[PDB]
Amino acid sequence: PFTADKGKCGLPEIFDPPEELERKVWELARLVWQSSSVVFHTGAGISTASGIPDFRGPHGVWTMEERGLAPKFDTTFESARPTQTHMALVQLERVGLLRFLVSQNVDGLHVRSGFPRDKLAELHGNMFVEECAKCKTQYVRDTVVGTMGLKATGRLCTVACRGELRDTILDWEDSLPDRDLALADEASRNADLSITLGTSLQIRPSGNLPLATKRRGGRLVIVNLQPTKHDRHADLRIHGYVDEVMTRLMKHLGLEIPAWDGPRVLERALPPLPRPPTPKLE
Numbered sequence: 160p161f162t163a164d165k166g167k168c169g170l171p172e173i174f175d176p177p178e179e180l181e182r183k184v185w186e187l188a189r190l191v192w193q194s195s196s197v198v199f200h201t202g203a204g205i206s207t208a209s210g211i212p213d214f215r216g217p218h219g220v221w222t223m224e225e226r227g228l229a230p231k232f233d234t235t236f237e238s239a240r241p242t243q244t245h246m247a248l249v250q251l252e253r254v255g256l257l258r259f260l261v262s263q264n265v266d267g268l269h270v271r272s273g274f275p276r277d278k279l280a281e282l283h284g285n286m287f288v289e290e291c292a293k294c295k296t297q298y299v300r301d302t303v304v305g306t307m308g309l310k311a312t313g314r315l316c317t318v319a320c321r322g323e324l325r326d327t328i329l330d331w332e333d334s335l336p337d338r339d340l341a342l343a344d345e346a347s348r349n350a351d352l353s354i355t356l357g358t359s360l361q362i363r364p365s366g367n368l369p370l371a372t373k374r375r376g377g378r379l380v381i382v383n384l385q386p387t388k389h390d391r392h393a394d395l396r397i398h399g400y401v402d403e404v405m406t407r408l409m410k411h412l413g414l415e416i417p418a419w420d421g422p423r424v425l426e427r428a429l430p431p432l433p434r435p436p437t438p439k440l441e
Protein backbone atom coordinates (compact mmCIF):
# COMPACT_ATOMS: atom_id res chain seq x y z
CA PRO A 160 0.00 0.00 0.00
CA PHE A 161 2.83 2.37 1.07
CA THR A 162 5.37 -0.07 -0.38
CA ALA A 163 3.18 -0.76 -3.49
CA ASP A 164 5.67 -1.24 -6.44
CA LYS A 165 5.49 1.90 -8.49
CA GLY A 166 7.89 0.49 -11.18
CA LYS A 167 10.53 2.41 -13.07
CA CYS A 168 10.06 6.14 -12.79
CA GLY A 169 11.62 9.24 -14.41
CA LEU A 170 13.48 7.40 -17.22
CA PRO A 171 14.95 9.69 -19.85
CA GLU A 172 12.75 10.96 -22.59
CA ILE A 173 13.52 10.21 -26.30
CA PHE A 174 12.84 12.67 -29.20
CA ASP A 175 12.82 11.20 -32.69
CA PRO A 176 14.18 13.94 -34.79
CA PRO A 177 11.77 15.53 -37.27
CA GLU A 178 12.48 13.59 -40.51
CA GLU A 179 12.51 10.29 -38.65
CA LEU A 180 9.29 11.33 -36.90
CA GLU A 181 7.58 12.15 -40.28
CA ARG A 182 8.72 8.87 -41.72
CA LYS A 183 7.38 6.91 -38.72
CA VAL A 184 3.98 8.67 -38.68
CA TRP A 185 3.62 7.84 -42.47
CA GLU A 186 4.27 4.25 -41.61
CA LEU A 187 1.68 4.29 -38.82
CA ALA A 188 -0.81 5.69 -41.50
CA ARG A 189 0.15 2.78 -43.66
CA LEU A 190 -0.62 0.29 -40.97
CA VAL A 191 -3.89 1.96 -40.07
CA TRP A 192 -4.87 1.75 -43.77
CA GLN A 193 -3.96 -1.96 -43.99
CA SER A 194 -5.67 -3.13 -40.78
CA SER A 195 -9.12 -4.64 -40.39
CA SER A 196 -9.23 -4.18 -36.60
CA VAL A 197 -7.40 -1.28 -34.77
CA VAL A 198 -7.35 -1.15 -30.97
CA PHE A 199 -5.87 1.80 -29.17
CA HIS A 200 -4.42 1.59 -25.66
CA THR A 201 -4.10 4.83 -23.75
CA GLY A 202 -2.40 5.96 -20.50
CA ALA A 203 -1.63 9.04 -18.58
CA GLY A 204 0.59 10.68 -21.04
CA ILE A 205 -2.43 11.50 -23.37
CA SER A 206 -3.65 13.95 -20.71
CA THR A 207 -0.45 15.79 -19.73
CA ALA A 208 -1.13 18.42 -22.46
CA SER A 209 -4.40 19.19 -20.66
CA GLY A 210 -2.63 19.91 -17.33
CA ILE A 211 -2.90 16.51 -15.62
CA PRO A 212 0.50 15.04 -14.67
CA ASP A 213 1.42 11.47 -15.52
CA PHE A 214 2.72 8.87 -13.05
CA ARG A 215 6.24 7.96 -14.22
CA GLY A 216 7.24 10.86 -16.42
CA PRO A 217 9.98 13.20 -15.39
CA HIS A 218 7.39 15.21 -13.38
CA GLY A 219 4.99 12.40 -12.79
CA VAL A 220 3.24 11.71 -9.46
CA TRP A 221 5.37 8.74 -8.50
CA THR A 222 8.57 10.20 -10.00
CA MET A 223 8.17 13.36 -7.97
CA GLU A 224 7.26 11.47 -4.78
CA GLU A 225 10.54 9.49 -5.15
CA ARG A 226 12.52 12.74 -5.00
CA GLY A 227 10.40 14.34 -2.21
CA LEU A 228 8.48 16.80 -4.46
CA ALA A 229 4.78 17.20 -5.27
CA PRO A 230 3.30 16.72 -8.73
CA LYS A 231 1.65 19.85 -10.18
CA PHE A 232 -1.81 20.18 -11.83
CA ASP A 233 -2.65 23.05 -14.12
CA THR A 234 -6.28 22.20 -14.04
CA THR A 235 -8.94 20.40 -12.02
CA PHE A 236 -10.43 17.26 -13.26
CA GLU A 237 -13.74 19.09 -13.91
CA SER A 238 -12.15 21.91 -15.81
CA ALA A 239 -9.74 19.68 -17.88
CA ARG A 240 -10.32 19.70 -21.54
CA PRO A 241 -9.82 16.70 -23.80
CA THR A 242 -6.60 16.95 -25.80
CA GLN A 243 -6.21 16.89 -29.60
CA THR A 244 -5.42 13.22 -29.05
CA HIS A 245 -8.62 12.50 -27.21
CA MET A 246 -10.69 14.19 -29.89
CA ALA A 247 -8.72 12.38 -32.65
CA LEU A 248 -9.69 9.10 -31.03
CA VAL A 249 -13.43 10.32 -31.04
CA GLN A 250 -13.20 10.77 -34.84
CA LEU A 251 -11.39 7.63 -35.59
CA GLU A 252 -14.10 5.63 -33.87
CA ARG A 253 -16.86 7.63 -35.75
CA VAL A 254 -15.39 6.77 -39.16
CA GLY A 255 -14.87 3.08 -38.32
CA LEU A 256 -11.05 3.12 -38.08
CA LEU A 257 -10.95 2.28 -34.33
CA ARG A 258 -12.66 -0.92 -33.21
CA PHE A 259 -11.96 -0.54 -29.42
CA LEU A 260 -10.39 1.80 -26.85
CA VAL A 261 -8.53 0.45 -23.74
CA SER A 262 -7.56 3.03 -21.14
CA GLN A 263 -5.85 2.94 -17.85
CA ASN A 264 -6.76 6.57 -17.09
CA VAL A 265 -9.21 7.47 -14.42
CA ASP A 266 -9.32 11.13 -15.44
CA GLY A 267 -12.78 10.83 -17.13
CA LEU A 268 -11.69 12.51 -20.29
CA HIS A 269 -12.51 9.81 -22.85
CA VAL A 270 -16.10 9.64 -21.59
CA ARG A 271 -16.34 13.47 -21.42
CA SER A 272 -14.88 13.81 -24.96
CA GLY A 273 -18.01 12.04 -26.28
CA PHE A 274 -16.36 8.72 -26.89
CA PRO A 275 -18.92 5.88 -26.85
CA ARG A 276 -18.78 3.87 -23.59
CA ASP A 277 -19.62 0.59 -25.29
CA LYS A 278 -16.26 0.76 -27.23
CA LEU A 279 -14.30 1.81 -24.20
CA ALA A 280 -12.72 -0.13 -21.36
CA GLU A 281 -11.72 1.94 -18.34
CA LEU A 282 -9.53 -0.62 -16.69
CA HIS A 283 -8.68 1.35 -13.57
CA GLY A 284 -12.05 3.12 -13.18
CA ASN A 285 -13.18 6.67 -13.74
CA MET A 286 -13.31 9.29 -11.13
CA PHE A 287 -16.66 10.75 -12.35
CA VAL A 288 -18.39 7.38 -12.24
CA GLU A 289 -20.14 5.73 -9.35
CA GLU A 290 -21.58 2.20 -9.34
CA CYS A 291 -24.51 0.57 -7.42
CA ALA A 292 -23.33 -2.33 -5.30
CA LYS A 293 -26.82 -3.99 -5.63
CA CYS A 294 -27.93 -3.65 -9.29
CA LYS A 295 -24.49 -2.58 -10.82
CA THR A 296 -25.95 0.50 -12.52
CA GLN A 297 -23.33 3.27 -13.28
CA TYR A 298 -23.88 7.03 -13.01
CA VAL A 299 -21.58 9.38 -14.89
CA ARG A 300 -21.44 12.52 -12.79
CA ASP A 301 -20.50 16.03 -13.64
CA THR A 302 -18.16 16.26 -10.71
CA VAL A 303 -15.54 13.93 -9.37
CA VAL A 304 -16.96 11.37 -7.05
CA GLY A 305 -15.43 12.06 -3.60
CA THR A 306 -13.92 8.65 -2.83
CA MET A 307 -11.24 6.22 -3.96
CA GLY A 308 -10.92 2.50 -3.37
CA LEU A 309 -14.42 1.16 -4.16
CA LYS A 310 -15.92 2.90 -1.05
CA ALA A 311 -19.48 4.12 -0.41
CA THR A 312 -19.78 7.74 -1.69
CA GLY A 313 -22.84 8.56 0.47
CA ARG A 314 -25.46 8.61 -2.39
CA LEU A 315 -28.09 5.95 -3.26
CA CYS A 316 -29.27 4.26 -6.36
CA THR A 317 -32.32 5.77 -8.08
CA VAL A 318 -33.32 2.79 -10.39
CA ALA A 319 -37.14 2.17 -10.92
CA CYS A 320 -33.45 0.20 -5.72
CA ARG A 321 -31.81 2.31 -2.90
CA GLY A 322 -28.46 0.39 -3.11
CA GLU A 323 -25.22 2.07 -1.77
CA LEU A 324 -23.33 3.86 -4.60
CA ARG A 325 -19.54 3.41 -4.69
CA ASP A 326 -16.51 4.92 -6.58
CA THR A 327 -14.89 2.85 -9.27
CA ILE A 328 -11.24 3.84 -8.43
CA LEU A 329 -9.31 0.63 -7.91
CA ASP A 330 -6.85 0.43 -5.05
CA TRP A 331 -3.49 -1.38 -5.23
CA GLU A 332 -5.05 -4.75 -4.17
CA ASP A 333 -8.32 -4.44 -6.20
CA SER A 334 -8.79 -6.75 -9.25
CA LEU A 335 -9.74 -5.07 -12.55
CA PRO A 336 -13.40 -4.90 -13.61
CA ASP A 337 -14.23 -8.15 -15.31
CA ARG A 338 -16.41 -6.67 -17.99
CA ASP A 339 -13.87 -4.05 -19.03
CA LEU A 340 -11.07 -6.55 -18.86
CA ALA A 341 -12.83 -9.26 -20.70
CA LEU A 342 -13.79 -6.86 -23.54
CA ALA A 343 -10.27 -5.29 -23.67
CA ASP A 344 -8.81 -8.78 -23.83
CA GLU A 345 -11.13 -9.96 -26.58
CA ALA A 346 -10.48 -6.78 -28.52
CA SER A 347 -6.76 -7.05 -28.06
CA ARG A 348 -6.67 -10.73 -29.11
CA ASN A 349 -8.63 -10.17 -32.37
CA ALA A 350 -7.02 -6.93 -33.33
CA ASP A 351 -4.45 -6.88 -36.19
CA LEU A 352 -2.95 -3.57 -34.96
CA SER A 353 -2.61 -2.28 -31.38
CA ILE A 354 -1.34 1.27 -31.01
CA THR A 355 -0.25 2.38 -27.50
CA LEU A 356 -0.35 6.14 -26.62
CA GLY A 357 1.25 7.69 -23.47
CA THR A 358 1.65 4.53 -21.46
CA SER A 359 4.88 3.07 -20.15
CA LEU A 360 3.06 -0.35 -20.11
CA GLN A 361 4.39 -1.38 -16.72
CA ILE A 362 1.14 -2.45 -15.05
CA ARG A 363 -0.20 -5.85 -15.60
CA PRO A 364 -2.51 -7.01 -16.93
CA SER A 365 -3.28 -3.57 -18.49
CA GLY A 366 0.20 -3.16 -20.04
CA ASN A 367 0.29 -6.67 -21.37
CA LEU A 368 -2.89 -6.49 -23.48
CA PRO A 369 -1.24 -4.81 -26.40
CA LEU A 370 1.05 -8.00 -26.60
CA ALA A 371 -1.97 -10.14 -27.10
CA THR A 372 -2.28 -8.51 -30.54
CA LYS A 373 1.09 -10.08 -31.44
CA ARG A 374 -0.40 -13.64 -31.12
CA ARG A 375 -1.75 -14.32 -34.57
CA GLY A 376 0.42 -12.01 -36.53
CA GLY A 377 -0.77 -8.68 -35.16
CA ARG A 378 1.30 -5.54 -35.46
CA LEU A 379 2.11 -3.39 -32.36
CA VAL A 380 2.82 0.34 -32.41
CA ILE A 381 4.08 2.17 -29.30
CA VAL A 382 3.89 6.02 -29.13
CA ASN A 383 5.67 7.33 -26.00
CA LEU A 384 8.29 9.84 -24.96
CA GLN A 385 9.97 7.38 -22.52
CA PRO A 386 10.93 3.75 -23.03
CA THR A 387 8.20 1.31 -22.15
CA LYS A 388 8.27 -2.21 -20.88
CA HIS A 389 7.48 -3.84 -24.24
CA ASP A 390 9.56 -1.75 -26.63
CA ARG A 391 11.39 -4.77 -27.95
CA HIS A 392 8.09 -6.36 -29.10
CA ALA A 393 6.93 -3.26 -30.98
CA ASP A 394 7.01 -3.17 -34.82
CA LEU A 395 7.23 0.58 -34.61
CA ARG A 396 8.11 2.91 -31.82
CA ILE A 397 7.50 6.59 -32.20
CA HIS A 398 9.23 8.93 -29.75
CA GLY A 399 7.24 12.13 -29.74
CA TYR A 400 4.53 14.16 -28.22
CA VAL A 401 1.25 12.28 -28.84
CA ASP A 402 -0.65 15.39 -29.92
CA GLU A 403 1.99 16.01 -32.58
CA VAL A 404 1.81 12.28 -33.75
CA MET A 405 -1.96 12.18 -33.79
CA THR A 406 -2.40 15.45 -35.63
CA ARG A 407 0.08 14.33 -38.30
CA LEU A 408 -1.58 11.01 -38.53
CA MET A 409 -5.09 12.50 -38.95
CA LYS A 410 -3.81 14.85 -41.67
CA HIS A 411 -2.39 11.86 -43.63
CA LEU A 412 -5.57 10.01 -43.14
CA GLY A 413 -7.57 12.92 -44.46
CA LEU A 414 -9.62 13.48 -41.26
CA GLU A 415 -10.51 16.52 -39.19
CA ILE A 416 -10.14 16.50 -35.48
CA PRO A 417 -13.50 17.51 -34.30
CA ALA A 418 -14.61 20.17 -31.97
CA TRP A 419 -15.37 19.44 -28.29
CA ASP A 420 -18.92 20.51 -27.36
CA GLY A 421 -18.01 20.50 -23.57
CA PRO A 422 -18.71 17.42 -21.36
CA ARG A 423 -21.06 14.87 -22.95
CA VAL A 424 -21.76 11.17 -22.26
CA LEU A 425 -22.45 8.90 -25.03
CA GLU A 426 -23.53 5.35 -24.13
CA ARG A 427 -23.64 3.68 -27.48
CA ALA A 428 -21.60 4.11 -30.57
CA LEU A 429 -23.57 6.01 -33.35
CA PRO A 430 -23.71 4.73 -36.91
CA PRO A 431 -20.29 5.04 -38.70
CA LEU A 432 -19.66 8.12 -40.76
CA PRO A 433 -18.26 8.27 -44.28
CA ARG A 434 -14.40 8.21 -44.45
CA PRO A 435 -11.85 9.08 -47.23
CA PRO A 436 -10.97 6.34 -49.71
CA THR A 437 -7.76 4.43 -48.92
CA PRO A 438 -4.48 4.95 -50.81
CA LYS A 439 -2.95 2.34 -52.91
CA LEU A 440 -0.20 0.78 -50.84
CA GLU A 441 2.25 -1.06 -53.18
Ligand SMILES: Nc1ncnc2c1ncn2[C@@H]1O[C@H](COP(=O)(O)OP(=O)(O)OC[C@H]2O[C@H](O)[C@H](O)[C@@H]2O)[C@@H](O)[C@H]1O
Pocket residue numbers: 172201202203204205207208213214215216219263264265283357358359360361362382383384385386399400401402
Ligand atom coordinates in the same frame (compact mmCIF):
# COMPACT_ATOMS: atom_id res chain seq x y z
N1 LIG B 1 2.61 14.44 -24.25
C1 LIG B 1 3.12 13.22 -24.35
N2 LIG B 1 3.38 12.56 -25.52
C2 LIG B 1 3.92 11.33 -25.48
N3 LIG B 1 4.23 10.64 -24.38
C3 LIG B 1 3.93 11.20 -23.16
C4 LIG B 1 3.47 12.55 -23.07
N4 LIG B 1 3.39 12.85 -21.79
C5 LIG B 1 3.74 11.80 -21.09
N5 LIG B 1 4.10 10.83 -21.92
C6 LIG B 1 4.66 9.50 -21.53
O1 LIG B 1 3.56 8.82 -21.00
C7 LIG B 1 3.97 7.63 -20.31
C8 LIG B 1 2.95 7.52 -19.20
O2 LIG B 1 3.33 6.39 -18.33
P1 LIG B 1 2.88 6.30 -16.79
O3 LIG B 1 3.23 7.71 -16.36
O4 LIG B 1 3.45 5.03 -16.27
O5 LIG B 1 1.27 6.11 -16.88
P2 LIG B 1 0.46 4.74 -17.23
O6 LIG B 1 -0.82 5.31 -17.88
O7 LIG B 1 1.15 3.75 -18.19
O8 LIG B 1 0.26 4.18 -15.82
C9 LIG B 1 -0.40 2.93 -15.59
C10 LIG B 1 -1.10 3.05 -14.27
O9 LIG B 1 -0.07 3.09 -13.22
C11 LIG B 1 -0.46 4.04 -12.20
O10 LIG B 1 -0.06 3.44 -10.95
C12 LIG B 1 -1.99 4.25 -12.44
O11 LIG B 1 -2.63 3.09 -11.92
C13 LIG B 1 -2.08 4.16 -14.00
O12 LIG B 1 -3.44 3.78 -14.47
C14 LIG B 1 5.36 8.01 -19.77
O13 LIG B 1 6.16 6.86 -20.15
C15 LIG B 1 5.67 9.38 -20.40
O14 LIG B 1 6.96 9.47 -20.97
Ligand SMILES: Oc1ccc2ccccc2c1-c1nc2ccccc2n2cccc12
Pocket residue numbers: 203211212213214220230265266307
Ligand atom coordinates in the same frame (compact mmCIF):
# COMPACT_ATOMS: atom_id res chain seq x y z
O1 LIG C 1 -5.51 8.90 -7.64
C1 LIG C 1 -5.13 9.57 -8.76
C2 LIG C 1 -6.11 9.59 -9.76
C3 LIG C 1 -5.87 10.19 -10.96
C4 LIG C 1 -4.64 10.82 -11.23
C5 LIG C 1 -4.39 11.42 -12.49
C6 LIG C 1 -3.18 12.00 -12.76
C7 LIG C 1 -2.19 12.01 -11.82
C8 LIG C 1 -2.39 11.45 -10.59
C9 LIG C 1 -3.62 10.82 -10.23
C10 LIG C 1 -3.88 10.18 -8.95
C11 LIG C 1 -2.84 10.08 -7.92
N1 LIG C 1 -3.02 9.02 -6.88
C12 LIG C 1 -2.46 8.97 -5.60
C13 LIG C 1 -2.56 7.82 -4.79
C14 LIG C 1 -1.98 7.79 -3.52
C15 LIG C 1 -1.29 8.90 -3.05
C16 LIG C 1 -1.20 10.05 -3.82
C17 LIG C 1 -1.73 10.09 -5.12
N2 LIG C 1 -1.72 11.27 -5.93
C18 LIG C 1 -1.32 12.57 -5.58
C19 LIG C 1 -1.60 13.43 -6.65
C20 LIG C 1 -2.24 12.66 -7.67
C21 LIG C 1 -2.34 11.35 -7.24
Ligand SMILES: [Zn+2]
Pocket residue numbers: 291292293294295296316317318320321322
Ligand atom coordinates in the same frame (compact mmCIF):
# COMPACT_ATOMS: atom_id res chain seq x y z
ZN1 LIG D 1 -29.15 -0.03 -7.75
